[PDB]
Structures are given as structure tokens and as C-alpha cells.
């Protein structure tokens with residue numbers, strides 16, 4: 001029997017013609033998250049409620065509905081229930097949802113719960129914006145030069161989870177097929193050898209890049225950079241790059257700049273020329289440090305996006321306050337992007353900034369831009385005030401140390 | 416007919432019991448390299464000759480022997496000769512060799528020449544040390560905290576080059592085998608889909624990690640960190656990590672620290688405890704910025720090593736002076752790690768620091784540590800003097816701009 005309680009007051013968000021219809025009293029499912037989820041999620045709920053109350057003068061209000069995945073799900077639904085079918089149904093039904101960090105168990109042969117949510121719900125965009133908040137302690141000299149938006153492909157690549165263990169019957173069978181039927185001679189050591197499969201498709205690539213370009217247009221961004229290791233992986237990463245450029249030409253009027261390969265796409269709303277370009281992935285990890293100002297919207301495959309979003313977050317001092325969304329055509333799931341940090345769980349200590357800024361993305365996604373703007377303003381003021389959680393405080397002089405809950409209040413105080 | 420000229424004076428380095436036997440007059444093959452190879456290679460030859468002359472008072476001298484690969488090879492050997500069989504034979508025969516950057520052609524369906532050299536010669540270690548040279552302009556606040564040595568696996572991973580183009584007969588055949596014979600259901604879009612194969616073996620992993628641990632022992636380093644994305648790629652990256660820890664236990668007496676998973680390995684020469692630990696790859700790209708001092712020797716797979724070595728080089732301001740070696744059991748090939756930068760080729764402008772420091776690694780590999788130490792000392796003094804090439808000069812105030820050749824001389828001046 002379901003243990004989810006549908007709020008008495010509240011209405012379901014609906015979707016018509018690829019446009020969300022958000023009532024004044026939307027029901028929003030949330031997953032508390034494991035470990036420090038118990039600390040950051042309540043802070044998020046309070047900050048969001050305050051921003052919504054202030055922005056719309058009580059006309060609008062979210063009806064929060066708790067749903068389950070992770071350790072807490074096992075405590076609620078029983079022994080091996082880490083991801084209840086109901087959770088997939090409810091996120092799809094209610095269209096917009098948010099989650100804290102999740103514990104995926106080890107030793108039971110089950111794969112990342114975050115990835116499972118993304119794939120099962122076909123949330124093919126992992127959207128991770130990375131900007132600098134003035135006053136944040138950073139390991140780099142000029143973090144203010146970083147203002148990028150990562151569109152990470154979320155449904156394919158080596159994340160597909162297709163692989164077989166060394167010495168297993170399945171692995172030997174695949175290896176035999178490769179060597180004997182496909183004539184593969186490039187496996188250096190075919191014995192005691194694990195094998196993984198990396199898929200990349202035209203449809204998967206183009207839906208991701210299409211979203212990135214539409215985002216650059218909608219937000220008057222300066223460029224979209226396709227990041228790939230296509231010089232080594234010609235038919236996956238290289239194909240991603242080629243299909244991305246092709247999509248720009250075929251759907252957005254992209255035209256050759258000089259002798260190429262970069263293209264220009266005209267923003268149909270502002271007339272601005274958006275540059276479509278590409279950078280090889282290893283070099284890109286250098287470029288984001290050395291020439292951050294030259295980059296804006298990034299479009300890349302699953303694994304590369306994983307790496308890039310972490311590297312960027314670190315450089316702006318944002319390891320614990322990096323927002324993230326997982327967006328598909330039918331629903332969207334916003335998430336804390338850090339781990340469960342169980343050593344601090346329940347101590348009201350850690351930074352709720354990541355889940356709060358993912359909630360900012362959520363409000364913006366709902367078209368509640370005024371409430372979203374208040375969170376940004378609040379976050380900016382609290383950090384500028386040097387009234388911060390231990391993770392910032394320990395890197396600064398003259399800061400005031402706040403608990404997790406207290407930092408949530410500081411954000412509200414600065415709205 | 417071979418166009419290589421074996422130096423009249425000079426003797427072949429030999430290998431006995433896994434130990435190099437280097438004569439006083441060793442013949443060393445070198446590949447000039449394409450593009451800026453014409454600039455940096457002569458600088459390297461002069462600096463190396465000076466260090467060798469100064470260190471051993473004329474008793475020792477390298478007999479340089481030019482050999483070919485890349486664009487220049489086509490000019491020498493003819494039309495489609497990008498990598499002559501002779502070059503593979505000569506590097507193996509002469510045991511130690513060095514190369515500038517290489518041009519791999521596009522449109523002819525041939526794969527990276529650098530990777531081809533590594534795989535054909537079974538140079539399974541890509542060795543990339545990253546340290547800071549005082550006075551180098553860096554984008555980070557504390558580059559001096561970075562002093563790491565990357566052991567990047569060089570013979571397997573997705574670098575194997577096993578892949579098939581979307582819509583090709585081969586791809587469709589592999590996909591059919593996967594879905595129909597292996598029961599694979601995780602391919603999101605099986606049509607118009609490129610496919611790549613990622614192998615990781617026990618033997619490939621252990622020979623790489625074995626070298627990393629022997630290096631930590633030989634050089635009294637503090638730790639070896641296995642970097643991997645094993646939480647998603649369980650049977651390749653995860654297997655790499657597990658096999659690495661296992662090798663530490665089985666061959667080096669590694670013992671559990673506390674409740675694990677980190678191990679301690681006792682240095683049999685100094686008694687120092689070497690920590691064996693692991694970090695997930697995305698988090699590691701954050702850790703090298705935020706806690707660089709905690710890391711030392713790194714052991715990782717091919718693609719991860721590609722990314723990590725670039726990210727580290729950038730942060731120490733070393734994008735154009737990063738040294739690199741490719742080492743196997745029978746021979747070794749040292750390399751400039753930057754590209755061919757054809758826009759500047761022949762202008763005597765670019766930084767020869769990368770190929771010079773790879774030559775430092777080469778001298779050290781030969782047991783000519785005194786000559787190697789002189790190059791390090793020279794490089795340190797020239798940079799400290801602010802007498803540098805344009806790539807450093809443009810980021811500094813009060814520097815003296817030197818040509819490529821002139822920076823080579825500055826290094827010698829500071830020996």
C-alpha cells in the first residue's frame with residue numbers, strides 16, 4: 001500500500017503543447033535524500049516557501065508531497081525497495097520534482113539510483129549551470145570569469161550500463177564474437193578482461209544539442225561549444241560533434257564562419273550571432289581554467305559532462321553549492337549534486353546551497369521567475385555578508401559561522 | 416631504401432635483466448616532429464648536448480640519429496608513409512628515443528600516430544610528471560602545492576580503437592548480436608547508433624599499477640591514488656581499482672589502514688609508509704584543485720589519464736612545458752606533449768620547455784641523472800629570471816621576451 005499522501009489542498013501541474021501549465025497551488029513531489037538530506041532539504045523547503053510567499057504575496061503556494069527513493073525508501077516500503085515503481089509514476093504524473101542526495105547500496109549489484117531515475121524517466125538533459133557568487137572562496141585567481149551552462153547528455157554513452165565481468169561466461173562470449181565474427185584484433189589482453197559498450201546515436205545526440213541551442217537562444221547566450229574526444233572515438237564522440245554541427249545547420253540556419261569549422265547561428269529574437277564551436281575534451285579541461293571567458297553553453301556526452309560539471313564547480317568554489325536539473329520532455333527532476341556526507345548527517349552543519357539553487361532552477365522551470373530571482377538575490381547577499389556554513393567559513397577570514405538551518409535563514413534575510 | 420643514417424661514431428644501448436646498459440656514446444633516435452617541431456627540436460638537441468657536456472666533462476656524448484613519422488615521413492619516404500615500419504624497428508632496437516609533436520592526417524581514416532606508436536611498441540605506461548616551476552604564471556592561487564606523477568595506462572581502454580559507424584553494416588551486426596544474443600535492453604536508440612568497445616584486463620591493469628608502485632618506492636613518494644569511475648563502469652574502471660588494490664596486497668605487502676579501503680605499503684628502502692587509496696574520477700578533478708597537496712603518484716586508465724594530465728598541466732601554468740614519456744618493457748619514447756601549432760611553425764617563437772623536460776626524463780631514464788639535474792636547474796633559473804618565451808611573457812609583468820632558440824640558451828646559461 002502506498003505511503004505517499006497526496007496533499008488535500010493543491011493541484012497537479014499539467015503539460016500542453018510542450019508548455020507547462022502551473023496552477024497557483026502546485027503539488028511538488030520531493031525526495032528528502034539520505035545522509036545530509038535530512039539537513040539540507042528542510043532548509044530548502046523553508047527558503048523556497050519564503051521566496052514564493054514574498055514574490056507573489058500569498059497568491060501562490062507549493063503543496064509539498066514527500067515521495068521516496070534510497071535508504072529512506074527501504075525504511076518506508078520495506079527491505080529491497082530502493083526505488084519504488086510509485087516514485088517513477090508520481091514524478092511523471094506531477095511533472096516537476098526535487099531531490100536531496102541519494103544512497104545507492106554496494107554489494108547488492110544495483111546501479112546508481114540517480115542514473116536509474118534519469119534513464120527510467122528519460123530525463124535526457126542533465127542541466128548544470130556554473131557561475132560565481134562574489135565572496136565565495138575559490139582556488140583560482142579569477143573565478144568571476146566563469147559563467148557557463150552545461151548540457152550533459154543523460155540517456156546514453158557508457159552510462160548505458162552495458163558491461164560484463166572479467167572471466168564471466170558472458171564476457172568470454174562477447175570477446176569471442178568480437179575476435180571471431182567481427183575480426184577484432186585490437187584487444188591487447190583478451191583473457192581476464194572486462195568489456196563495456198559505448199553507444200551514441202543520432203537521435204540521442206540531436207535532442208540534447210537541440211535543447212542546448214534553444215537555451216542559448218532563449219537566454220541570449222554567446223556560444224555553444226561541443227566538447228568531445230572525437231579524434232580517438234570517431235564513431236561515438238566524433239559522431240556527437242558532427243551531428244551537433246549538422247543539427248545547427250539544418251534546424252537553426254547555422255552558417256560557416258570563415259573557413260570553418262565554427263558556425264554562426266542568428267538569434268531569431270535578438271539578432272545576436274551565436275557561435276557554434278568545438279573543443280577536444282582534454283584541451284577543454286585546460287581551457288576552462290585558462291580562458292574561461294571564451295565559453296558559455298556547453299554540449300557534451302554523459303561521461304564528459306560528469307567530469308566537466310565537477311571541474312567547473314570546483315574552480316568557482318562551488319563544490320557544495322552546484323545546482324543541477326534532469327530534464328526530459330514529460331517531466332523534470334531537480335537535484336542536490338553533492339553526496340550524502342553521512343559523517344555530518346543530522347548535525348545541521350553542511351551547506352544547503354546546492355539543493356537551494358537547484359530549487360531556484362525548479363522555480364524558473366515553472367515560470368516562477370520572480371521567486372527564483374529572490375533566491376539568487378538572497379544567496380548573493382548571504383555570501384557577500386560572509387554569513388556562511390563551515391565549508392566556506394574555514395576558507396575565509398572574518399566570516400560568521402552559520403549552521404545549515406541558519407544559512408537558510410540568512411538567504412531569506414537577504415531577499 | 417632506408418633514408419636513416421646510422422651515426423658512424425656511437426653505440427647501441429642494450430637491455431639485460433630489465434636493466435639498461437648505456438654506453439658513453441649512445442645512439443639516440445629522434446623524430447623532429449611536425450609544425451613547431453622544427454623550432455623546439457633543435458632547441459632540445461642543443462640544451463641536451465650542453466647538459467651532457469657539462470655533467471660528464473666530455474666523456475659522454477649522444478649520437479643523435481634522425482628517424483621519421485608524421486608529415487615529414489611522407490616527404491622522405493613517399494606518399495602514404497606516415498609511420499614507416501623502420502621507425503618501429505629502430506625505436507625497439509635502440510631502446511630510447513624522443514619525438515616532437517606529430518601531425519595525424521584527417522579524411523584518410525587513419526588513427527592518432529601518437530597512439531599508434533604507443534600501441535605498436537607496447538609502451539603501456541604513459542608517464543606524465545606535473546610539478547610547478549617557481550615564477551611560472553598560473554591561473555590558480557597555489558600552484559606550488561602540485562607535485563604529482565601520472566601513470567596513465569597506455570595499451571587498452573576505449574583507446575583500443577574498436578568501434579563502428581552509425582548505420583554501417585558492422586554496427587547493425589554488433590547491435591543485433593547485443594540485443595538478440597546478449598539480451599541487451601539498455602541501448603536507448605539502437606538505430607543510427609555508433610558503438611564503441613571498452614576493454615580492461617587484469618594483466619593490463621596490474622602491469623601499469625605495478626610500475627606506479629615501484630616508482631613510488633624508488634622515488635620515496637607518499638602515496639599512489641587509483642582514479643576511476645568504477646561506480647558506473649563496474650567491470651572496467653571498477654575492476655581496475657580492485658585489481659590495483661589486489662596487486663598492492665599480493666606483491667607489495669599492502670595492509671588495511673583502519674577499516675579500509677586504503678592500504679599502507681612499506682617502502683622496503685626507507686621504511687616510509689606509502690598510502691594506496693582511490694578517488695572517483697569526477698571528484699578527483701575537483702580534488703586536484705582543492706587539495707592538491709594530498710596527492711602524489713596517480714594510477715589510472717587511458718582516457719582518464721589523458722584528461723588528468725591535461726588538467727594538471729594547465730593549473731601549474733604548464734600547458735606548453737609538460738613533459739611526457741611512453742615506457743614499455745623493451746623500449747621507451749619520450750615526447751613533446753603539446754600539438755604542432757602550425758601557425759607559428761618556423762618562427763622560432765614557441766616554448767621548447769615541454770620537449771626539453773621530456774629530454775630531462777629521457778636522460779634520467781638512461782641513468783644520466785647529473786645531466787638531467789642540470790636541465791632542471793637550468794629550467795628553474797631561466798623561468799625565475801623572467802627570461803621566457805611569448806606564452807609566459809604575455810601573462811607576466813617585467814619579463815624579457817625570448818625567442819624559442821633564445822630560451823634554450825637561457826636554460827644553458829642557468830646550468
Ligand SMILES: Nc1ncnc2c1ncn2[C@@H]1O[C@H](COP(=O)(O)O)[C@@H](O)[C@H]1OP(=O)(O)O
Nearest residue numbers: 320321338339340341342350351352353354391
Ligand atoms: N553541502 C555540502 N557542504 C559542505 N561540504 C560538502 C557538502 N556536500 C559534500 N561535501 C563534502 O563532501 C564530503 C562528502 O562526500 P560524499 O557524500 O561524496 O561521500 C564531505 O566530507 C564534505 O567535505 P569535508 O568532509 O572535507 O568537509
Ligand SMILES: Nc1ncnc2c1ncn2[C@@H]1O[C@H](COP(=O)(O)O)[C@@H](O)[C@H]1OP(=O)(O)O
Nearest residue numbers: 735736753754755756757765766767768769806
Ligand atoms: N610549446 C608551446 N608554447 C606556447 N604555446 C603553445 C605550445 N604548444 C601549444 N601551444 C598553444 O596551443 C596552440 C596549438 O594548438 P594545437 O597544436 O593543439 O592545434 C597554439 O595556438 C598555442 O596557443 P596560442 O595560439 O593561444 O598562443
Ligand SMILES: NC(=O)c1ccc[n+]([C@@H]2O[C@H](COP(=O)(O)O)[C@@H](O)[C@H]2O)c1
Nearest residue numbers: 256257258259260261262263277278758
Ligand atoms: N572560424 C573558425 O572556424 C575558427 C575561429 C577561431 C578558432 N577556430 C579553431 O581554433 C583552433 C585555432 O584557431 P586560431 O585561428 O584562433 O588559432 C583551430 O583548431 C580552429 O578549429 C576556428
Ligand SMILES: NC(=O)c1ccc[n+]([C@@H]2O[C@H](COP(=O)(O)O)[C@@H](O)[C@H]2O)c1
Nearest residue numbers: 343671672673674675676677678692693
Ligand atoms: N583509512 C581509510 O581507508 C581512509 C582514510 C581516510 C579517508 N578515506 C576515504 O575518504 C572518504 C571519507 O574519508 P573521511 O573519514 O576522511 O571523511 C571515504 O570514502 C573513505 O573511503 C579512507
Ligand SMILES: [Mg+2]
Nearest residue numbers: 306307310697
Ligand atoms: Mg558526477
Ligand SMILES: [Mg+2]
Nearest residue numbers: 282721722725
Ligand atoms: Mg591528451
